[PDB]
Amino acid sequence: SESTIENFLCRSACVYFTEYENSGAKRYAEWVLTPRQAAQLRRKLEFFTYVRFDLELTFVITSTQQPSTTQNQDAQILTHQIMYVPPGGPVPDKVDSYVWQTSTNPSVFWTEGNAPPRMSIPFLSIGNAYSNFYDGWSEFSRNGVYGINTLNNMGTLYARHVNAGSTGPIKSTIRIYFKPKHVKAWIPRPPRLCQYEKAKNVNFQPSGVTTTRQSITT
Amino acid sequence: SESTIENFLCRSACVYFTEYENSGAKRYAEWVLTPRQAAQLRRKLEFFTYVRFDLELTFVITSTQQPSTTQNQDAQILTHQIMYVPPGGPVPDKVDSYVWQTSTNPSVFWTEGNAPPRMSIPFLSIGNAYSNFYDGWSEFSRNGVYGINTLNNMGTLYARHVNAGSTGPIKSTIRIYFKPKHVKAWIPRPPRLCQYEKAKNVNFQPSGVTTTRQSITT
Amino acid sequence: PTMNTPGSCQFLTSDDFQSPSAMPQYDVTPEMRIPGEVKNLMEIAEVDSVVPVQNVGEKVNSMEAYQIPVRSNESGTQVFGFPLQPGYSSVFSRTLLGEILNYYTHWSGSIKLTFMFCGSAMATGKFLLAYSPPGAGAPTKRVDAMLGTHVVWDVGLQSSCVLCIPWGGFITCWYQTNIVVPADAQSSCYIMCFVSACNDFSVRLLKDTPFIS
Amino acid sequence: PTMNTPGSCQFLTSDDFQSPSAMPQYDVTPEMRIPGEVKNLMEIAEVDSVVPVQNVGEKVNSMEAYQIPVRSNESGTQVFGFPLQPGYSSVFSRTLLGEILNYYTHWSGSIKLTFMFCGSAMATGKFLLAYSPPGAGAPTKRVDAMLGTHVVWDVGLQSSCVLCIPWGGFITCWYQTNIVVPADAQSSCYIMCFVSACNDFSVRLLKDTPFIS
Amino acid sequence: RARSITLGNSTITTQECANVVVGYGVWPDYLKDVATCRFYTLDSVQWQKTSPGWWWKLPDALSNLGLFGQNMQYHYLGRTGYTVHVQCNASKFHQGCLLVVCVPEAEMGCATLDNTPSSAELLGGDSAKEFADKPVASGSNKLVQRVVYNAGMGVGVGNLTIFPHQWINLRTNNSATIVMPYTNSVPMDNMFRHNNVTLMVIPFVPLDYCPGSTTYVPITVTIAPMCAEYN
């Protein structure tokens, strides 16, 4: 009654950490949506071969002041913009680019000091299910990477400060929460014995079957 | 009509006091959930041998500025995270540990200047009732503490500042409110005559039966 | 269109709202039947509890606080007496009925007392149990105690007497006759006194107990 | 007129609310039937998986961890034994039933074991499969193992034995008789052991796995 | 008049009007070994002019006694009701009162606030542990606080009648019979690891007699487990 795949795969799990500054070398965040970065969620999803689900992206944006020597700093409420890029969408090369105005990318505006912004994404795969394990080459004629089918693409996420708050520097952080909804699974497979190495593939280092003991009769 | 166990055991009672600083030696709070610290509630609960109830945890988080000699301090809204650890859950060894991201511990995020955050906990005991008075040894083979059954465990609570507000130091406090809900009791027992000594056990110092008078006929 | 009235965004400690459950879709462990389920505090205040009537001096720090000494030699002499205020009086202070009362401010109901003569079977005598109503002070002589509400208790026949008190007043016991014993029987006996709530008993305005430190 | 209660404006991680869809009026691609649709984890824990019973030394880093050696020459001698705790015990650690259990805190249900003798057809003998209940320690001699719950397994007739265990206990195997083989047949054989959940099996309180690093 | 009650092979002699007080309005029943249903008569304890009290732990009281001791040994967990009979035979020239009470989950305090007491000092096997009048010294000892006006649990001894009790007044009464249901949060529990009920006997009004009488009154305690089942 509790071990259903729903109650087993419907937990809000943080999947990203990054920072962007109102003024500075880094002024915007970018992260291609993937459930492979977080090992805790990756290992839970690698129980099944084919999986299909919806998302509920919920962000947590916090701002902290920086150690600067400018005086007479008067802060104004900060506004953050989070542009979701659909697969094949234009990606902002810079912070003040024109792509931040395309009516296709559904950006959500947020003003500091409110309930954290949340949006949902449907099943975007052209195929009929996201495939965790692919046993082929993405390119039709081959000469393409192994096990890298583009059917699982889920788009990219971009975030920036719409308005600089004060003359003094401000650095903000954003934590992206992943919540699969209406989950379905197919073809159960064995749990990953060895520890993960690269999020890109299934490469691993050989590991023993289990912890050893003194004698068989003990 | 008023003396029912519900109306007698359903009062919001503060049970904890602690402080954590944005920067400093103490940067996070921790308190194993127990109804034994507050004597006012402990003595009310020690009327009955077996008691079962739900909780309604409501916190009150207030922040005050500190006496520092840094200038040009510009504050940003503070966000506090309160991670509830279920029994047997991983416990953060430090403030910036990875355990603060486990999707199991249901942490509630809160931004200063809103209605204080509140969450509820069901009956978590594996047994069929929380037992106030145990007359045995927790360890099956003995050589274990007396009257310390682990069946009453209710988990731990952790709290921290997700984002430092300003360069200048900030110290926050948190008061945890305990509200038993849907209370049931069994086997009434006599009220504790002597004053409490250690929250760990029932050890006490011998006390007189009552206040004395001049003569029996007076 | 909504408008937020005053009283919004406040943590009024004594309020009953719906609360967001932290761990949902979690099983609860079905409850077994455990013998003896309290539903109301009153069921506890209906149990007789012995009273430290003789809380004189170092008696409180011994078991001899509960027994009332009744000697053979000495008529108008008085056995005991105490004011009938189960709340503030030191006699009914830590009694089961008294402790429960110390949790409330208002209360109305009858009080039942029960005396159990704990003496040798041969021992015989009579006692005058007189209850003076509130406005009047405690009686001084035996005659004055007789002329009010009284119960002449004969230990030789009945061994336990029950007094139901309405609506503080006073309770006084007098030696109607000295204890008479055949040879080889002790003449120094003792009396014990139980207290219990009776008939209607209500308690209003829950407050904190004053016995915590 | 509305009033905002406590618990408003908070991100309680474990809550189920309606969420504003980012891209509305977008088609979904109808789902085809794919063979084999898991609906409950239990259906996975009902599959027998081989057990590394002999996880001794460098056996874990080889295929010889799953086979139990049974020699011809040496009675009361013992084949194997391991404590019956599918959760914390190193034997049932990475088993399909064990891994699933490492995701939960409470669990109640029967455990089914199955031994498959992998020896030459001519090879014959008898084995004593004894299960000691929790409170008792593992037996020392063959007699003590016989006097409890036991199953005398004859390899000559039956090639696979099944043990259903209620409600940790111990499992011990003894050589009732040495292996008897006609000439031209090897006398050194092996035994394999599968584990599987049986009958009722429930799991409560989802937690994180301890095998991540 | 007298009457005989037979369970298995043992037999007890009691009056016609025994005045049984059921535990909590419930009679012991199986959860939803008959050979263990006998009258395990323990020893007698001499009640004297200065005796403070006594107390028994029912599971422990029957740990060494025959079938019950053998059963609770190999078997893991289980549950058991009880029917404690306290018989106190004294003359007509004696006088005194006793409070016979069965206290469930009676956790006892330790003389040293810092630590809990030891198992041997807490449990009296095949004998009855007794209270004391003066307070126990607070040193570096794992002793149990045996003050009688606190009973050890830490509560005023007077209001110990909330628990299923019964009073023996040597003026009218002579014995008490208390039926006790299985009270535990857990359906079945290891009898050796945890004791569910404690039998306490306290002499409120002291024994007294003229010179030339028996110097003591021999209280006698009989336990009979009702509806015992094991796993």
PDB file of C-alpha atoms in Angstrom, chain B:
ATOM      1  CA  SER B   1     -18.083  18.790  29.545  1.00  0.00           C
ATOM      2  CA  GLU B   2     -14.785  20.638  29.928  1.00  0.00           C
ATOM      3  CA  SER B   3     -12.689  18.057  31.794  1.00  0.00           C
ATOM      4  CA  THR B   4     -12.398  15.632  28.874  1.00  0.00           C
ATOM      5  CA  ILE B   5      -8.900  14.417  28.063  1.00  0.00           C
ATOM      6  CA  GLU B   6      -9.100  16.298  24.772  1.00  0.00           C
ATOM      7  CA  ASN B   7      -9.719  19.758  26.318  1.00  0.00           C
ATOM      8  CA  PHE B   8      -7.183  18.790  29.069  1.00  0.00           C
ATOM      9  CA  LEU B   9      -4.383  17.715  26.694  1.00  0.00           C
ATOM     10  CA  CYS B  10      -4.798  19.913  23.599  1.00  0.00           C
ATOM     11  CA  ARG B  11      -3.066  23.146  24.586  1.00  0.00           C
ATOM     12  CA  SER B  12      -0.224  24.665  22.582  1.00  0.00           C
ATOM     13  CA  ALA B  13       2.815  24.533  24.868  1.00  0.00           C
ATOM     14  CA  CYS B  14       6.277  25.848  24.046  1.00  0.00           C
ATOM     15  CA  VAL B  15       8.811  23.060  24.483  1.00  0.00           C
ATOM     16  CA  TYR B  16      12.097  24.433  23.168  1.00  0.00           C
ATOM     17  CA  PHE B  17      14.338  27.498  23.053  1.00  0.00           C
ATOM     18  CA  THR B  18      17.487  27.865  20.971  1.00  0.00           C
ATOM     19  CA  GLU B  19      19.432  30.203  18.723  1.00  0.00           C
ATOM     20  CA  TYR B  20      21.455  29.857  15.492  1.00  0.00           C
ATOM     21  CA  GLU B  21      23.550  32.584  13.766  1.00  0.00           C
ATOM     22  CA  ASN B  22      24.051  33.345  10.035  1.00  0.00           C
ATOM     23  CA  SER B  23      27.825  33.397  10.777  1.00  0.00           C
ATOM     24  CA  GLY B  24      29.459  32.038  13.954  1.00  0.00           C
ATOM     25  CA  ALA B  25      30.329  29.048  16.189  1.00  0.00           C
ATOM     26  CA  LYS B  26      26.670  27.874  16.279  1.00  0.00           C
ATOM     27  CA  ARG B  27      24.977  27.962  12.840  1.00  0.00           C
ATOM     28  CA  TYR B  28      22.200  25.398  13.232  1.00  0.00           C
ATOM     29  CA  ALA B  29      19.708  24.135  15.802  1.00  0.00           C
ATOM     30  CA  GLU B  30      18.917  20.539  16.745  1.00  0.00           C
ATOM     31  CA  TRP B  31      16.393  19.064  19.215  1.00  0.00           C
ATOM     32  CA  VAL B  32      15.235  15.390  19.421  1.00  0.00           C
ATOM     33  CA  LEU B  33      11.407  15.553  19.636  1.00  0.00           C
ATOM     34  CA  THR B  34      10.379  14.697  23.247  1.00  0.00           C
ATOM     35  CA  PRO B  35       7.456  15.762  25.521  1.00  0.00           C
ATOM     36  CA  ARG B  36       9.699  15.347  28.629  1.00  0.00           C
ATOM     37  CA  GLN B  37      11.557  18.679  28.629  1.00  0.00           C
ATOM     38  CA  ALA B  38       8.563  20.864  29.507  1.00  0.00           C
ATOM     39  CA  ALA B  39       7.575  19.953  33.057  1.00  0.00           C
ATOM     40  CA  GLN B  40       4.108  21.478  32.660  1.00  0.00           C
ATOM     41  CA  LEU B  41       3.293  19.078  29.821  1.00  0.00           C
ATOM     42  CA  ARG B  42       5.331  16.153  31.243  1.00  0.00           C
ATOM     43  CA  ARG B  43       3.354  16.188  34.518  1.00  0.00           C
ATOM     44  CA  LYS B  44       0.038  16.372  32.612  1.00  0.00           C
ATOM     45  CA  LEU B  45       1.028  13.410  30.412  1.00  0.00           C
ATOM     46  CA  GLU B  46       2.189  11.343  33.388  1.00  0.00           C
ATOM     47  CA  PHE B  47      -1.435  10.967  34.483  1.00  0.00           C
ATOM     48  CA  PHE B  48      -1.874   8.008  32.116  1.00  0.00           C
ATOM     49  CA  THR B  49       0.313   4.949  31.386  1.00  0.00           C
ATOM     50  CA  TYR B  50      -0.352   4.553  27.620  1.00  0.00           C
ATOM     51  CA  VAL B  51      -1.073   7.640  25.438  1.00  0.00           C
ATOM     52  CA  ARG B  52      -1.458   7.977  21.612  1.00  0.00           C
ATOM     53  CA  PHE B  53      -1.717  11.310  19.723  1.00  0.00           C
ATOM     54  CA  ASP B  54      -0.867  13.345  16.610  1.00  0.00           C
ATOM     55  CA  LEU B  55       1.227  16.538  16.599  1.00  0.00           C
ATOM     56  CA  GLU B  56       0.956  20.048  15.183  1.00  0.00           C
ATOM     57  CA  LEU B  57       4.408  21.609  15.210  1.00  0.00           C
ATOM     58  CA  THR B  58       4.313  25.401  14.897  1.00  0.00           C
ATOM     59  CA  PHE B  59       7.539  27.393  15.029  1.00  0.00           C
ATOM     60  CA  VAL B  60       8.171  31.084  15.684  1.00  0.00           C
ATOM     61  CA  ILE B  61      11.415  32.311  14.115  1.00  0.00           C
ATOM     62  CA  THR B  62      12.567  35.854  14.962  1.00  0.00           C
ATOM     63  CA  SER B  63      15.833  37.552  13.878  1.00  0.00           C
ATOM     64  CA  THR B  64      17.801  40.319  15.643  1.00  0.00           C
ATOM     65  CA  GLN B  65      20.896  42.232  14.463  1.00  0.00           C
ATOM     66  CA  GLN B  66      24.175  41.897  16.342  1.00  0.00           C
ATOM     67  CA  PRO B  67      26.731  44.369  17.747  1.00  0.00           C
ATOM     68  CA  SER B  68      29.258  44.422  14.880  1.00  0.00           C
ATOM     69  CA  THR B  69      31.675  47.070  13.562  1.00  0.00           C
ATOM     70  CA  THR B  70      31.150  46.450   9.846  1.00  0.00           C
ATOM     71  CA  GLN B  71      29.795  49.390   7.835  1.00  0.00           C
ATOM     72  CA  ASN B  72      27.589  49.680   4.706  1.00  0.00           C
ATOM     73  CA  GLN B  73      25.406  46.753   5.885  1.00  0.00           C
ATOM     74  CA  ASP B  74      22.502  46.162   3.418  1.00  0.00           C
ATOM     75  CA  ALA B  75      20.090  43.414   4.621  1.00  0.00           C
ATOM     76  CA  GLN B  76      18.158  41.060   2.256  1.00  0.00           C
ATOM     77  CA  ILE B  77      15.042  39.034   3.275  1.00  0.00           C
ATOM     78  CA  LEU B  78      16.115  35.939   5.306  1.00  0.00           C
ATOM     79  CA  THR B  79      14.977  32.379   4.492  1.00  0.00           C
ATOM     80  CA  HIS B  80      14.947  29.628   7.113  1.00  0.00           C
ATOM     81  CA  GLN B  81      14.798  25.878   6.504  1.00  0.00           C
ATOM     82  CA  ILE B  82      13.447  23.407   9.066  1.00  0.00           C
ATOM     83  CA  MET B  83      14.319  19.774   8.317  1.00  0.00           C
ATOM     84  CA  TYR B  84      12.271  17.156  10.187  1.00  0.00           C
ATOM     85  CA  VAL B  85      14.268  13.902  10.591  1.00  0.00           C
ATOM     86  CA  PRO B  86      12.099  10.710  10.715  1.00  0.00           C
ATOM     87  CA  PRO B  87      13.399   8.065  13.217  1.00  0.00           C
ATOM     88  CA  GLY B  88      16.491   6.329  11.729  1.00  0.00           C
ATOM     89  CA  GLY B  89      16.999   9.256   9.296  1.00  0.00           C
ATOM     90  CA  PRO B  90      20.469  10.720   8.354  1.00  0.00           C
ATOM     91  CA  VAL B  91      21.392  13.668  10.668  1.00  0.00           C
ATOM     92  CA  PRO B  92      23.409  16.659   9.284  1.00  0.00           C
ATOM     93  CA  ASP B  93      26.890  16.543  10.931  1.00  0.00           C
ATOM     94  CA  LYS B  94      27.448  20.141   9.754  1.00  0.00           C
ATOM     95  CA  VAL B  95      25.482  23.149   8.415  1.00  0.00           C
ATOM     96  CA  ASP B  96      26.413  22.908   4.709  1.00  0.00           C
ATOM     97  CA  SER B  97      26.234  19.100   4.621  1.00  0.00           C
ATOM     98  CA  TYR B  98      24.569  17.088   1.856  1.00  0.00           C
ATOM     99  CA  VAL B  99      21.877  15.578   4.157  1.00  0.00           C
ATOM    100  CA  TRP B 100      19.923  18.849   3.878  1.00  0.00           C
ATOM    101  CA  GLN B 101      18.896  17.688   0.370  1.00  0.00           C
ATOM    102  CA  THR B 102      17.475  14.170   1.111  1.00  0.00           C
ATOM    103  CA  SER B 103      13.888  14.062  -0.329  1.00  0.00           C
ATOM    104  CA  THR B 104      12.823  11.962   2.684  1.00  0.00           C
ATOM    105  CA  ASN B 105      13.229  14.545   5.439  1.00  0.00           C
ATOM    106  CA  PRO B 106      10.316  16.936   4.816  1.00  0.00           C
ATOM    107  CA  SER B 107      11.913  20.363   5.217  1.00  0.00           C
ATOM    108  CA  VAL B 108       9.689  23.474   5.120  1.00  0.00           C
ATOM    109  CA  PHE B 109      11.137  26.701   3.674  1.00  0.00           C
ATOM    110  CA  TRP B 110      10.029  30.023   5.149  1.00  0.00           C
ATOM    111  CA  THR B 111      10.726  33.664   4.315  1.00  0.00           C
ATOM    112  CA  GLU B 112      10.713  36.213   7.120  1.00  0.00           C
ATOM    113  CA  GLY B 113       7.603  38.351   7.414  1.00  0.00           C
ATOM    114  CA  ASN B 114       4.849  35.813   6.766  1.00  0.00           C
ATOM    115  CA  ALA B 115       2.552  33.631   8.829  1.00  0.00           C
ATOM    116  CA  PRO B 116       4.688  31.315  10.999  1.00  0.00           C
ATOM    117  CA  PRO B 117       5.282  27.887   9.453  1.00  0.00           C
ATOM    118  CA  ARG B 118       3.354  24.874  10.790  1.00  0.00           C
ATOM    119  CA  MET B 119       3.405  21.139   9.962  1.00  0.00           C
ATOM    120  CA  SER B 120       1.820  18.031  11.458  1.00  0.00           C
ATOM    121  CA  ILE B 121       3.221  14.580  12.307  1.00  0.00           C
ATOM    122  CA  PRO B 122       1.082  11.325  12.542  1.00  0.00           C
ATOM    123  CA  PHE B 123       1.507   8.496  15.068  1.00  0.00           C
ATOM    124  CA  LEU B 124       4.998   7.137  14.149  1.00  0.00           C
ATOM    125  CA  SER B 125       5.334   4.472  16.925  1.00  0.00           C
ATOM    126  CA  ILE B 126       5.760   0.863  15.619  1.00  0.00           C
ATOM    127  CA  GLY B 127       3.896  -0.249  18.760  1.00  0.00           C
ATOM    128  CA  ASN B 128       0.255   0.517  19.384  1.00  0.00           C
ATOM    129  CA  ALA B 129       0.740   3.359  21.887  1.00  0.00           C
ATOM    130  CA  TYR B 130       3.374   5.653  23.312  1.00  0.00           C
ATOM    131  CA  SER B 131       4.291   4.319  26.747  1.00  0.00           C
ATOM    132  CA  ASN B 132       5.158   6.909  29.377  1.00  0.00           C
ATOM    133  CA  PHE B 133       6.278   4.396  32.014  1.00  0.00           C
ATOM    134  CA  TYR B 134       8.286   1.342  30.921  1.00  0.00           C
ATOM    135  CA  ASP B 135       9.274  -1.204  33.598  1.00  0.00           C
ATOM    136  CA  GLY B 136      12.056  -3.033  31.812  1.00  0.00           C
ATOM    137  CA  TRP B 137      15.355  -2.949  29.908  1.00  0.00           C
ATOM    138  CA  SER B 138      15.403  -1.778  26.248  1.00  0.00           C
ATOM    139  CA  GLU B 139      18.037  -4.409  25.227  1.00  0.00           C
ATOM    140  CA  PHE B 140      16.512  -7.906  24.608  1.00  0.00           C
ATOM    141  CA  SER B 141      19.387  -9.703  26.445  1.00  0.00           C
ATOM    142  CA  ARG B 142      19.439  -6.967  29.183  1.00  0.00           C
ATOM    143  CA  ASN B 143      22.736  -5.062  29.916  1.00  0.00           C
ATOM    144  CA  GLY B 144      20.692  -2.071  28.583  1.00  0.00           C
ATOM    145  CA  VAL B 145      19.359   1.101  30.285  1.00  0.00           C
ATOM    146  CA  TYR B 146      16.247   0.674  32.531  1.00  0.00           C
ATOM    147  CA  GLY B 147      12.898   2.185  31.356  1.00  0.00           C
ATOM    148  CA  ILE B 148      14.274   3.481  27.998  1.00  0.00           C
ATOM    149  CA  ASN B 149      12.116   1.679  25.357  1.00  0.00           C
ATOM    150  CA  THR B 150      12.889   3.076  21.852  1.00  0.00           C
ATOM    151  CA  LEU B 151       9.189   2.660  20.843  1.00  0.00           C
ATOM    152  CA  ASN B 152       8.490   6.310  21.877  1.00  0.00           C
ATOM    153  CA  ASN B 153      11.063   7.808  19.416  1.00  0.00           C
ATOM    154  CA  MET B 154       9.488  10.749  17.475  1.00  0.00           C
ATOM    155  CA  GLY B 155      12.487  11.899  15.345  1.00  0.00           C
ATOM    156  CA  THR B 156      14.743  15.012  15.438  1.00  0.00           C
ATOM    157  CA  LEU B 157      14.305  18.642  14.206  1.00  0.00           C
ATOM    158  CA  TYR B 158      17.040  20.720  12.440  1.00  0.00           C
ATOM    159  CA  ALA B 159      16.898  24.442  11.450  1.00  0.00           C
ATOM    160  CA  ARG B 160      19.338  26.737   9.540  1.00  0.00           C
ATOM    161  CA  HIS B 161      19.591  30.003   7.515  1.00  0.00           C
ATOM    162  CA  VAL B 162      19.377  29.060   3.803  1.00  0.00           C
ATOM    163  CA  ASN B 163      20.878  32.445   2.756  1.00  0.00           C
ATOM    164  CA  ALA B 164      23.022  34.841   4.819  1.00  0.00           C
ATOM    165  CA  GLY B 165      21.072  38.154   4.758  1.00  0.00           C
ATOM    166  CA  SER B 166      23.845  40.791   5.055  1.00  0.00           C
ATOM    167  CA  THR B 167      27.636  41.071   5.623  1.00  0.00           C
ATOM    168  CA  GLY B 168      26.752  42.109   9.222  1.00  0.00           C
ATOM    169  CA  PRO B 169      26.007  39.306  11.757  1.00  0.00           C
ATOM    170  CA  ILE B 170      22.388  38.138  12.440  1.00  0.00           C
ATOM    171  CA  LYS B 171      21.234  35.822  15.269  1.00  0.00           C
ATOM    172  CA  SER B 172      17.850  34.115  15.060  1.00  0.00           C
ATOM    173  CA  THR B 173      15.785  32.236  17.662  1.00  0.00           C
ATOM    174  CA  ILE B 174      13.123  29.491  17.223  1.00  0.00           C
ATOM    175  CA  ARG B 175      10.334  28.454  19.638  1.00  0.00           C
ATOM    176  CA  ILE B 176       8.753  25.058  18.915  1.00  0.00           C
ATOM    177  CA  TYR B 177       5.046  24.705  19.893  1.00  0.00           C
ATOM    178  CA  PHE B 178       3.688  21.211  20.782  1.00  0.00           C
ATOM    179  CA  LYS B 179      -0.016  20.493  20.218  1.00  0.00           C
ATOM    180  CA  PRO B 180      -1.226  16.904  20.706  1.00  0.00           C
ATOM    181  CA  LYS B 181      -4.220  16.147  18.507  1.00  0.00           C
ATOM    182  CA  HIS B 182      -6.761  13.319  18.606  1.00  0.00           C
ATOM    183  CA  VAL B 183      -5.522  12.259  22.048  1.00  0.00           C
ATOM    184  CA  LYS B 184      -6.298   8.907  23.676  1.00  0.00           C
ATOM    185  CA  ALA B 185      -5.268   7.657  27.103  1.00  0.00           C
ATOM    186  CA  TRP B 186      -5.245   4.394  29.023  1.00  0.00           C
ATOM    187  CA  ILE B 187      -4.653   3.181  32.619  1.00  0.00           C
ATOM    188  CA  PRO B 188      -4.922   6.333  34.801  1.00  0.00           C
ATOM    189  CA  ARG B 189      -2.151   6.614  37.471  1.00  0.00           C
ATOM    190  CA  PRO B 190      -1.517   8.995  40.473  1.00  0.00           C
ATOM    191  CA  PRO B 191      -0.055  12.534  39.935  1.00  0.00           C
ATOM    192  CA  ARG B 192       3.746  12.908  40.522  1.00  0.00           C
ATOM    193  CA  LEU B 193       4.106  14.125  44.171  1.00  0.00           C
ATOM    194  CA  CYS B 194       7.853  14.985  44.074  1.00  0.00           C
ATOM    195  CA  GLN B 195       9.516  17.609  41.776  1.00  0.00           C
ATOM    196  CA  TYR B 196      11.270  16.354  38.575  1.00  0.00           C
ATOM    197  CA  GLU B 197      15.098  15.952  38.628  1.00  0.00           C
ATOM    198  CA  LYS B 198      16.362  14.493  35.293  1.00  0.00           C
ATOM    199  CA  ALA B 199      14.270  14.442  32.062  1.00  0.00           C
ATOM    200  CA  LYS B 200      16.039  11.107  31.318  1.00  0.00           C
ATOM    201  CA  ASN B 201      14.317   9.024  34.060  1.00  0.00           C
ATOM    202  CA  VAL B 202      11.951   8.974  37.060  1.00  0.00           C
ATOM    203  CA  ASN B 203      14.676   9.390  39.700  1.00  0.00           C
ATOM    204  CA  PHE B 204      13.553  11.715  42.506  1.00  0.00           C
ATOM    205  CA  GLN B 205      14.385  12.900  46.056  1.00  0.00           C
ATOM    206  CA  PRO B 206      12.000  11.723  48.843  1.00  0.00           C
ATOM    207  CA  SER B 207       9.372  14.392  49.729  1.00  0.00           C
ATOM    208  CA  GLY B 208       6.730  14.822  52.478  1.00  0.00           C
ATOM    209  CA  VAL B 209       3.127  13.877  51.747  1.00  0.00           C
ATOM    210  CA  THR B 210       1.724  17.420  52.227  1.00  0.00           C
ATOM    211  CA  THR B 211       2.038  20.830  54.007  1.00  0.00           C
ATOM    212  CA  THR B 212       1.862  20.509  57.842  1.00  0.00           C
ATOM    213  CA  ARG B 213      -0.417  22.384  60.323  1.00  0.00           C
ATOM    214  CA  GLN B 214      -0.396  23.227  64.058  1.00  0.00           C
ATOM    215  CA  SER B 215      -2.727  20.629  65.577  1.00  0.00           C
ATOM    216  CA  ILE B 216      -5.035  17.948  64.230  1.00  0.00           C
ATOM    217  CA  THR B 217      -8.149  19.640  65.690  1.00  0.00           C
ATOM    218  CA  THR B 218      -7.184  22.950  63.959  1.00  0.00           C
TER     219      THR B 218
END
